């Protein structure tokens, strides 16, 4: 019947325990979703080309030129940590868990409702809302992964993070192949670089439509749709960071002369002249064994060209790197490249009671020091005379190519067969949870956007759309805009995300770091006198672990 | 129930392979149909007589005189290729399949919605839309083919070709016997050529009515209708073409003197004088054996009176032919007769953002050379003396009947017991798929309008009508217009057409012609910036086959 | 996911582009560049890198003499001009046994 509810709201998190120190962390989320009728029932192919911004010499990083297909369908995405866990559950997870596995995922749409908007045309405007019990809501679940994978977490467009606030689905779109050339320049370049959009190569064209690819369920006010349980196969995720760098792998040298009295100035000493020492080095042409020169098992992290932009057929794009600066946790202004920056709105953490269109931003700094500090690096000649003369060293203050602001650290890559690095840490609340593995023959070792990556295939996207509510005046052969009764839908989305985690132990005398509420941050987790909520970012890998 | 959906939307084209190189093609096609109530609840017997146009001497070809019964019903017709396949599927079929079989067909009307229209009459105009749960959609399936068969592909009045675009059903009418006389004329005919219309013979009157011949289902908003699976019995269809003509049948003559260097001028010479040759010819009284005078196994194609008009009881009509002019591939303007021409609107291929009533058109230049090039013919005396003189050869340039424009090829026919010719190629998207065989004692060898011809029966036409939503002021004895509430219906139609195809094989060293996307035709298959779509025609017989 | 286009074209035309519609320093999104607020197609996070750059026409010496550092793939957009084949894309030289 029309008057029978078709599902249950549920936003609880249950930590069920098991053997050998494991726990099932089953997260339930539920939302009210508001879907207007699409601006047009038709697919569009649209190009963005901001020559007004890129023509200005030196702004070549500001290129937004792309081709996209705009669809009438809307995308429902719950792939963000903020959709499942409130700050307290995250506190429990990151204070008590060591490793986190992703097991299953579920979702269902229920309590569909459709309403039509009537305008009175009275001189003082007014309008009345009527239910359309016979109208339908179109739902398509792309379980075969045929449609382009468009994770909403990247553009800050996933479902909201507050159970008690309604949400909307992101309008759906996907990239269409294009060609583009943009020669970089500097304030001071002559003329105007070639800044052109060559078009789209026919052999690369791929136009998709939901109708021709996925079975679409027509859901009336008395219907409900459930996707069915999905089972992941992702690699484990560690909730502990690693503090060791190359300088701290292995056995320290024996300190022949320890301090005798305590004090800030009372350092220890090794007591053996460096050229006279015992051990192993790869620097086979010198006798010096030092903490900077002694052989180590392998290398942690890697140096990458920072703010390197690589051009391909589609134009320029920044080179991604796994980790950012090391030891930059003290200042946000020193985050530099690698360390992600999130800019989000009021559906996803910004103080809700705020106004204006300045997004709320933060830069994530991880606890792991697998990064680099290029100002401390240097390249010196193989003879290895010490102290080194100006001519035998390439310091970071020495220019490359004559540019005084560009040094070798900008064009210097140290990735090799000895590199060790960790996966990207989870970012709460705005971080994406999982991502799809690329369809390339050879695949990357990690993704920067999601802690979990999907070895074979993983959950299909869910698309919604208001069915066309035509007026009596429809006429297919007319080329004008289709006449639609102004219709909108509110429906309830409910999902289940099932994790499996292992509790942590204490391997050391000291207490490790933990997240805790303190006076400097208490108000960030409570509503305001006028009902304003905000979700601040929380670190994931608080606990430390031994690397080697 | 009112609040429960009674069906699911589906387009997906599913390829399922069998053993021995066969593949099942299941084509799901789903639309949203829009149906206003009929203009009059009564059947109408109507005459059209464009006497004004045909009174102009020489315009007899433009005769449009006929009598029809106009019915209060609307026909839902899915008998065209564009209703089932998008260009990608057509590409796959016509590039990989050598033959095609029609297997089964099903359809269903569901998710029925009925709405009424009310007008406020307020000084600023406005009108509201209300659902009517008690209102019914009348649906009739003519399973026994009682009603006259009337495919809509000939009028471009079938269901539309875009799943995301709603479609109308075509108002239904059929022919009513009439008598017509039209003496042909030329600009310069004195007076008025005899041009009269006589009416209907009593013995050919047939007033079919749906209500008295077909069960009718009354569907409310919560009902559904399923036709059931119809299974075809048509002869198999070929997606290949025959390039051979009589000149390419048999064993070519041995070349005693083969060429000795590459070049377009370095031809070979047979080497044996023409009356000294060996071989067989049907010319019982001449010693010449030549590639024209040699005996061939049979005749491929046939000549026919082109742009010839024949008259019967009902008036003049054009004589149909299986194939058109030969050599049209070199110049499209020379195709003319035989090669079909399709004029269609926006529902069925024309760009949907175009203005005006001028429809898109195209002539179909098939790949099969079973046609004729009448300017290349000649008829000469049985004596066969050469080089033939004027008195002894009937050249195509010779005048016939005192007319410069008419030569013998206009009246020439060479169909006979030795004729071998092909079935019509499918025309995507606007071609008709299947056609009902005539009920004559002797049946045509083929139909020019569809590749498949039903042997015993083929699926009943689906007739729809909005039930009469009468007002309170009804008076069955009234001669004035009946008063009905303005009702219209939106009902989803879902069809399944199932084919069986044979995959092709590489019979030759060289590659064959294949449909492909290129920098020219590229954007024909993708939507415009404002969403405009268009479907262009696409050939079907690109792969050559060996006739003999 | 492309960026939502807050203002779309209204007629067909070579110049009728679309527009993201939001000032760049005011865009929501995620980027690896932690010391800027500009979010742009060149700067927005992507899962990984498709293809890689190499010191093209590098010659490297070993015990047996110099050899060209091989690379997996060639130029992008070279399909439109043979003069830009450059490194990566192989060149075959052959005779009458083989074509």
């Amino acid at each position, epitope marked *: 019947g029309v008057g029978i509810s078709t599902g249950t709201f549920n936003n609880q998190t249950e930590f069920k325990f098991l053997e050998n120190g494991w726990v099932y962390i089953t997260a339930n989320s539920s939302r009210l979703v508001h879907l207007n009728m699409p601006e047009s029932e038709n697919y569009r192919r649209v190009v963005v080309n901001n020559l*007004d911004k890129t023509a200005v010499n030196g702004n070549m990083a500001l290129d937004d030129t792309h081709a996209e297909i705009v669809t009438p369908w809307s995308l429902v995405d719950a792939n963000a940590w903020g959709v499942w866990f409130n700050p307290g559950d995250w506190q429990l997870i990151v204070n008590t868990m060591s490793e986190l596995h992703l097991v299953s995922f579920e979702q269902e749409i229920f309590n569909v409702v459709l309403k039509t908007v009537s305008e009175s045309a009275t001189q003082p405007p007014t309008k009345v809302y009527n239910n359309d019990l016979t109208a339908s809501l179109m739902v398509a679940l792309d379980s075969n992964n045929t449609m382009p994978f468009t994770p909403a977490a990247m553009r800050s467009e996933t479902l909201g993070f507050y159970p008690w606030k309604p949400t909307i689905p992101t309008p759906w779109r996907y990239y269409f192949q294009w060609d583009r050339t943009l020669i970089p320049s500097h304030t001071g370049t002559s003329g105007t670089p070639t800044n052109i959009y060559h078009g789209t190569d026919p052999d690369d064209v791929q136009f998709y439509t939901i109708e021709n690819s996925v079975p679409v369920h027509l859901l009336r006010t008395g219907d409900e749709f459930a996707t069915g349980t999905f089972f992941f196969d992702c690699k484990p995720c560690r909730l502990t960071h690693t503090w060791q760098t190359n300088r701290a792998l292995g056995l320290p040298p024996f300190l022949n002369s320890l301090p005798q009295s305590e004090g800030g100035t009372n350092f220890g000493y090794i007591g053996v002249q460096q050229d006279k020492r015992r051990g192993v080095t790869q620097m086979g042409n010198t006798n010096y064994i030092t903490e900077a020169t002694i052989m180590r098992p392998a290398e942690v992290g890697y140096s990458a060209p920072y703010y390197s932009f690589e051009a391909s057929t589609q134009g320029p794009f920044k080179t991604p790197i796994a980790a950012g600066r090391g030891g930059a946790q003290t200042d946000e202004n020193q985050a530099a490249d690698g360390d992600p920056r999130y800019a989000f709105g009021r559906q996803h953490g910004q103080k809700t009671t705020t106004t204006g269109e300045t997004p709320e931003r933060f830069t994530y700094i991880a606890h792991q020091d697998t990064g680099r500090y290029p100002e401390g690096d240097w390249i010196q000649n193989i003879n290895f005379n010490l102290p080194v003369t100006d001519d035998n060293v390439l310091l970071p203050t020495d220019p490359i190519g004559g540019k005084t602001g560009i040094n070798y650290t900008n064009i210097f890559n140290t990735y090799g067969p000895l590199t060790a690095l960790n996966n990207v840490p989870p970012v709460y609340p705005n971080g994406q949870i999982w991502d799809k593995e690329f369809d390339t023959d050879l695949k990357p070792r990690l993704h920067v956007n999601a802690p979990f990556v999907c070895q074979n295939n993983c959950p299909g996207q869910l698309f919604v759309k208001v069915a066309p509510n035509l007026t009596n005046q429809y006429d297919p052969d007319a080329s004008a805009n289709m006449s639609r009764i102004v219709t909108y839908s509110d429906f309830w989305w409910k999902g289940k995300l099932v994790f499996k985690a292992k509790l942590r132990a204490s391997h050391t005398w000291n207490p490790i770091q933990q997240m805790s509420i303190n006076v400097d941050n208490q108000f960030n987790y409570v509503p305001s006198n006028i009902g304003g909520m905000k979700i601040v970012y929380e670190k994931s890998q608080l606990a430390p672990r031994k690397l080697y | 129930g009112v609040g429960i959906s009674t069906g699911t939307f589906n387009n997906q084209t599913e390829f399922k392979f069998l053993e021995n190189g066969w593949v099942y093609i299941t084509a799901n096609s789903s639309r949203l149909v829009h149906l206003n109530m009929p203009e009059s609840e009564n059947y109408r017997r109507v005459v059209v007589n464009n006497l004004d146009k045909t009174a102009v001497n020489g315009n007899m070809a433009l005769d449009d005189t006929h009598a029809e019964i106009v019915t209060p019903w609307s026909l839902v017709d899915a008998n065209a290729w564009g209703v089932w396949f998008n260009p990608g599927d057509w590409q796959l079929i016509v590039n990989t399949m050598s033959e095609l079989h029609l297997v089964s067909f099903e359809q269903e009307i569901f998710n029925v919605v009925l709405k009424t229209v009310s007008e406020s009459a307020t000084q600023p105009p406005t009108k509201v839309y209300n659902n009517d749960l008690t209102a019914s959609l009348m649906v009739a399936l003519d399973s026994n083919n009682t009603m006259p068969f009337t495919p809509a592909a000939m009028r471009s009045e079938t269901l539309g070709f875009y799943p995301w675009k709603p479609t109308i059903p075509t108002p239904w009418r059929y022919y009513f016997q009439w008598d017509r006389t039209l003496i042909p004329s030329h600009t310069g005919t004195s007076g008025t050529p005899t041009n009269i219309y006589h009416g209907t013979d009593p013995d050919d009157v047939q007033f079919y009515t749906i209500e008295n011949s077909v069960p009718v289902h009354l569907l409310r908003t919560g009902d559904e209708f399923a036709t059931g699976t119809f299974f075809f019995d048509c002869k198999p269809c070929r997606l290949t073409h025959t390039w051979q003509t009589n000149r390419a049948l048999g064993l070519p003559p041995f070349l005693n003197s083969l060429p000795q260097s590459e070049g377009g001028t370095n031809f070979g010479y047979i080497g044996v004088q023409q009356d000294k040759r060996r071989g067989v010819t049907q010319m019982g009284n001449t010693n010449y054996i030549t590639e024209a005078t040699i005996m061939r196994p049979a005749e491929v194609g046939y000549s026919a009176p082109y742009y010839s008009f024949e008259a019967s009881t009902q008036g003049p009509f054009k004589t149909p032919i299986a194939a058109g002019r030969g050599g049209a591939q070199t110049d499209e303007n020379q195709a003319a007769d035989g090669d079909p021409r399709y004029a269609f609107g926006r529902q069925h291929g024309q760009k949907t953002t175009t203005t005006g009533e001028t429809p898109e058109r195209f002539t179909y230049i098939a790949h099969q050379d079973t046609g004729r090039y009448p300017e290349g013919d000649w008829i000469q005396n049985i004596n066969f003396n050469l080089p033939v003189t004027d008195d002894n050869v009937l050249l195509p340039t010779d005048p016939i009947g005192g007319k410069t424009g008419i030569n013998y090829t206009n009246i020439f026919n060479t169909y006979g017991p030795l004729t071998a010719l092909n079935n019509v190629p499918p025309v995507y998207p606007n071609g008709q798929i299947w056609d009902k065989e005539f009920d004559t004692d002797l049946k045509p060898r083929l139909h020019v309008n569809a590749p498949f011809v039903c042997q015993n029966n083929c699926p009943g036409q689906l007739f729809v009508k909005v039930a009469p939503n009468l007002t309170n002021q009804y008076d069955p004895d009234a001669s004035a217009n009946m008063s009905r509430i303005v009702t219209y219906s939106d009902f989803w139609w879902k069809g399944k057409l199932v084919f069986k195809a044979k995959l092709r094989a590489s019979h030759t060293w060289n590659p064959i012609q294949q449909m492909s996307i290129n920098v*020219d035709n*590229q954007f024909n298959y993708v939507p*415009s910036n404002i969403g405009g779509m268009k479907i262009v025609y696409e050939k079907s017989q690109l792969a050559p086959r060996k006739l003999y | 996911l492309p960026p939502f286009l807050n203002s779309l074209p209204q007629s067909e035309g070579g110049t009728n582009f679309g527009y993201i519609g939001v000032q760049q320093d005011k865009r929501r999104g995620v980027t690896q560049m932690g010391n800027t607020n500009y979010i742009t197609e060149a700067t927005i996070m992507r899962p990984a890198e498709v293809g890689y750059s190499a010191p093209y026409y590098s010659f490297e010496a070993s015990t047996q003499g110099p050899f060209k550092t091989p690379i997996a793939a060639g130029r992008g957009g070279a399909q439109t001009d043979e003069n830009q084949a450059a490194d990566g894309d192989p060149r075959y030289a052959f005779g009458r046994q083989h074509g």
Partner: antibody
Amino acid sequence: EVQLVESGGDLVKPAGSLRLSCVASGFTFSSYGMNWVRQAPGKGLQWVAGVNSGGFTGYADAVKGRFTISRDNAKNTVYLQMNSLTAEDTAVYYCAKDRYYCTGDYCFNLIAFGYWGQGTLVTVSS
Amino acid sequence: SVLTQPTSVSGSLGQRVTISCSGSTNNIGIVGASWYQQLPGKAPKLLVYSDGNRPSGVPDRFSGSNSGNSATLTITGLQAEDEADYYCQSFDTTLGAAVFGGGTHLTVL
């Protein structure tokens, strides 16, 4: 090297029509747009029309709605049908090809460059 | 739309000379000028691209510059053969049409 040739310019009466032709070799005709540019005796230059690879066309207001430009990619030939000619159309017409490969509706017909052909003269009078 | 140019310019043999063209934000301020040279009765040949580069075989004498809504062309080591008419060219981003300047004649003394 890029070579272009033109033909079809002739003295013609006002109104009516005239049809120019330009042919190309040495470059991939498909990947490049083609443009006509005209110059009256002793006067300045004026772009006439351009046609990208996909059949999309562009025109200047002085001819928009009067002339129709096209291509035949199979013959490296471009045509300009000049209907409704008037005396002001008397000028020399040149055939050009842009520097940078380009196709589609959003493609600028002519930015900078072209190995302009020798050109064809046109006069409208009676 | 149209680009402004000077009517004529003069220069002595071996000296340097300059020519200027003016436009608007949507023609020059976005796409730089491209300079063409036309000999008496011949089809014009380009001298300098908007890219700032010159075609193969063009003497190094010519060079171009751009500033805001205007552009400029210069000839170093003026020669007798350089006496010709010159034209600036750009692309009106609003009308989507190539815009050619009014032309300039250079006199060599």
